[PDB]
Amino acid sequence: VTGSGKKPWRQKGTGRARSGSIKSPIWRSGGVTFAARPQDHSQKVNKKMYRGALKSILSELVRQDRLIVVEKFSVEAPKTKLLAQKLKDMALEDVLIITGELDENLFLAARNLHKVDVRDATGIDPVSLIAFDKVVMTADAVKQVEEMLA
């Protein structure tokens, strides 16, 4: 705290309470007693625990029928109108779309829709596999996920 390290009054003689610093955390415009620092909240997860979790929730999405597998999922031109038409034809609104390739027209056509997210098979995460209502996997993306996860 910006201040001076001078006693605001002497120790005794006056009728007031003892005080040593105006920066005291009991004063107005004093310091914080346990003032915070920038800290890293990242936790370690073991690798086998991460894969155990993914194998658990992918098994659960199967048991809950929240997993849809298709051979191919492409949009011709990078248009969100085409993607929304295709998902309406699939009867899908809140969906994660995993593709074993890098499809740029699909990324661009899915960038404006907040109900829809498009990932690579490498870039899958458990919280997104849960936060989305349906998950559409290309069969190639299945082959890559099964290979990564043994």
Binding site: I57, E60, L61, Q64, V127, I130, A131
Partner: protein
């Protein structure tokens, strides 16, 4: 299985002591430290 259906295992998370928040908490005014020692002092204690 959603983010509002998860719950951890039993006995995994224990609450943790919070000293100096009332009589009912048990850890009252002194907070497990007794009265008027060196050990009750802030930073007090003897070395190894």
């Amino acid at each position: 299985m959603r983010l509002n259906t998860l719950s951890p295992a039993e006995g995994s998370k224990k609450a943790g002591k919070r000293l100096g928040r009332g009589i009912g908490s048990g850890l009252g005014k002194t907070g497990g430290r007794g009265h008027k020692g060196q050990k009750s002092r802030s930073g007090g204690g003897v070395r190894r």
